[PDB]
Amino acid sequence: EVAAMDFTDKLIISRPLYISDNADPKCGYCNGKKDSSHKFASPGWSDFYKGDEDKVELQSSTVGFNSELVNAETYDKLCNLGFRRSGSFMYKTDMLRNCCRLYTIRTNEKYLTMSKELKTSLKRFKKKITSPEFKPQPKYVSWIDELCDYEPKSTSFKAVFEPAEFTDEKYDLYVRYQHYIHSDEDNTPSQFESFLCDTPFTDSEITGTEKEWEQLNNWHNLQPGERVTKNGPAHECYYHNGKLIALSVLDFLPSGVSSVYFIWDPDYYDWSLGKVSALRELALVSKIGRPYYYLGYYIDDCPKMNYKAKFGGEILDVCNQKYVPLSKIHQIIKHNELFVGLNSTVASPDSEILITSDKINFDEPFINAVDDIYGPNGNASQNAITSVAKLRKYGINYSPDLQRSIYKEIPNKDVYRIPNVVPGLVPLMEIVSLFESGKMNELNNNVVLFDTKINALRIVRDFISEKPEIKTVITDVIRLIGLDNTKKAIIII
Ligand SMILES: [Zn+2]
């Protein structure tokens, strides 16, 4: 006998897509409009195009895959690889080629600086919901403890955690909010359902139990060292005298909480709910004893996204697979640069950084090595073209990227084709090593396919003998999520 397939431990995904189009209009953050000093990924590319910035057509570019099943531990890993979910679609930008530089940001109460601005938003909230008879304690150790004292005592305000389920009330509020912010989307009931209610998580992570939701809704009273069992998606409903005035869509992960989406009643602009809800969610992360609050993507030059910097924290270096505090690099990403860290005591990189050895230490001095690796005279492309040829010998249908520039120039597409060189994907030279060391044989008896032809699941038994189209899809999944995660995948082909 062999153990039944355990779908509490599987990631079911479609084959990867690489979607690239003109940033005007595809990019909702910049609309393809950038100052020429923000237009490129590095000073080396800025200088390569100095004087002809107007002959590049910026592109908006995403790579990812649809998910039919993911558990919270696996989604946590994907967040910490630089992915985000949009409904059930797991994606990231191509940070080398995209118009805007999107960084994965995370923070917590240790990073947070309670500025006058943030303090004012909490003070207003307290005044909106708190009776004049409330008597505060003479001292609160943290602003979190102050909030956890008065908020549950309000007779007019109540926030409720519940499963992420459609209601007419929620949808009507979303329509009004999306119109107030000038969403250029349909915003039909089905779209709201797929975006913010239906998810690829396990049923236990979606539905939970009555005890789990009651425990979560008691969070204001959690004591030090106490924890909650909840993982997976949730809605937090904000009620003022029985009326829904805001809805927070959140994912509970082993390492903390991710903010999916926040909507509020435009008539409540004077409650500062955008800032208040972020502070409440930071307080929640602290009270449930988890380390990080994830606000999604940070774009230093987009006002709709750089508000996240006010809560502090650290930014993911996808090339090193480590976080660096925002305060240490903010000055060198202010012109939409891509950052690739390298300790100053380390020789100039001869290649893309190996996602295998001696990790970067951001507590030691470091520099941005982006142009050594990915600049117009960097080494990444030379190494990738040589790897493509070796990989073709294993039946991997990759083609070499031979163009001089990573940018689209005025002259004066296969959605299954990923570029040879993408920051944060496994470099092709490392993919070669996996084949040459036999580490790719770890896929045998582990990775599973859903063959749409025969309409059945099939465990892969001899990877190298699979058809090239199949081997190529699997290898692209490895580039995106790594070998260990792919070994727990069911890939739909
Ligand atoms: Zn953009």
SS (H, E, C) 139-196: CCCCHHHHHHHHHHHCCCEEEEEECCCCCHHHHHHHHHHHHHCCCCCCCCHHHHHHHH
Question: Is residue 91 located within the same domain as residue 124?
Answer: no
In contact, 183 and 261? CB cutoff 8 Å: no
In contact, 202 and 208? CB cutoff 8 Å: no
Question: According to the annotation, is 79 in a ligand binding site?
Answer: no
Question: What CA–CA distance (Å, rounded) separates 425 from 358?
Answer: 19
Question: According to the annotation, is 148 in a ligand binding site?
Answer: no
Give the distance (Å) from ligand 1 centre to CA of residue 57. 12
Give the distance (Å) from ligand 1 centre to CA of residue 299. 9
Q: Phi first, then psi: give them for residue 11, nearest 5 degrees.
A: -115, 115
Question: Is residue 78 located within the same domain as residue 166?
Answer: no
Query: How buried is 35 (Cβ within 10 angstroms: 0-12 exposed, 13-18 middle, 19+ buried)?
Result: exposed
Amino acid at 405: S
CA dihedral of residues 63, 69, 72, 76 (deg, nearest 10)? -10
In contact, 202 and 71? CB cutoff 8 Å: yes
Q: Residue 344: inside a domain, yes or no?
A: no
Q: Which among 345, 348, 338, 319 is positioned nearest to 430, based on CA atoms? A: 319
Give the distance (Å) from ligand 1 centre to CA of residue 34. 8
Question: According to the annotation, is 99 in a ligand binding site?
Answer: yes
Those residues whose C-beta lies under 8 Å from the C-beta of residue 374, and which sit 6 or more positions away, are 41, 42, 96, 338, 340, 380, 406, 421, 423
Domain, as residue range, for 11? 7-100+375-492
CA distances from 174 to 197, 265, 421, 442 (A): 12, 8, 39, 46
CA distances from 254 to 79, 204, 205 (A): 12, 15, 12
Give the distance (Å) from ligand 1 centre to CA of residue 410. 18
Interrupted backbone of the chain, residues before each interruption (C–N > 2.5 Å):
356, 412
Question: According to the annotation, is 27 in a ligand binding site?
Answer: yes
Give the distance (Å) from ligand 1 centre to CA of residue 98. 7
Give the distance (Å) from ligand 1 centre to CA of residue 102. 9
Q: Phi first, then psi: give them for residue 205, nearest 5 degrees.
A: -75, -20
Give the distance (Å) from ligand 1 centre to CA of residue 306. 13
Q: Residue 255: inside a domain, yes or no?
A: yes
Residue 440 DSSP SS3:
helix
Place of tokens 């609050």: 293
Give the distance (Å) from ligand 1 centre to CA of residue 55. 17
Pairing label, strands 157-162, 103-107: unpaired
Question: Around Cβ 356, how many Cβ atoms within 10 Å?
Answer: 8
Question: Is residue 122 located within the same domain as residue 250?
Answer: yes
Please give the DSSP secondary-structure letter assigned to residue 221.
Answer: G
For 310, the token pair is 């006010």
Query: How buried is 281 (Cβ within 10 angstroms: 0-12 exposed, 13-18 middle, 19+ buried)?
Result: buried
Give the distance (Å) from ligand 1 centre to CA of residue 89. 20
Q: Which among 306, 284, 268, 394 is positioned nearest to 103, based on CA atoms? A: 306
Question: Is residue 142 located within the same domain as residue 238?
Answer: yes
Question: Is residue 382 located within the same domain as residue 264?
Answer: no
Question: What CA–CA distance (Å, rounded) separates 238 from 244?
Answer: 6
Q: b/e string for 462-483 if b means 16 or more Cβ within 10 A?
A: ebeebeeebbbbbbbbbbbbbb
Q: Residue 462: inside a domain, yes or no?
A: yes
In contact, 48 and 70? CB cutoff 8 Å: no
Question: Is residue 139 located within the same domain as residue 51?
Answer: no
Amino acid at 74: T
Give the distance (Å) from ligand 1 centre to CA of residue 19. 14
- List helix spans (H) across 40-87: 43-48, 72-79
- List helix spans (H) across 294-427: 303-306, 326-329, 370-374, 380-393
Place of tokens 């996240």: 308
Question: Is residue 96 located within the same domain as residue 171?
Answer: no
Question: What CA–CA distance (Å, rounded) separates 60 from 137?
Answer: 52
Query: Total domain count for the chain?
Result: 2
Question: What CA–CA distance (Å, rounded) separates 380 from 388?
Answer: 12
Question: Is residue 444 located within the same domain as residue 413?
Answer: yes
Domain boundary among 247, 273, 290: 290
Structure's resolution in angstroms: 2.0
Q: Residue 430: inside a domain, yes or no?
A: yes
Give the distance (Å) from ligand 1 centre to CA of residue 431. 30
Give the distance (Å) from ligand 1 centre to CA of residue 58. 8
In contact, 198 and 206? CB cutoff 8 Å: no
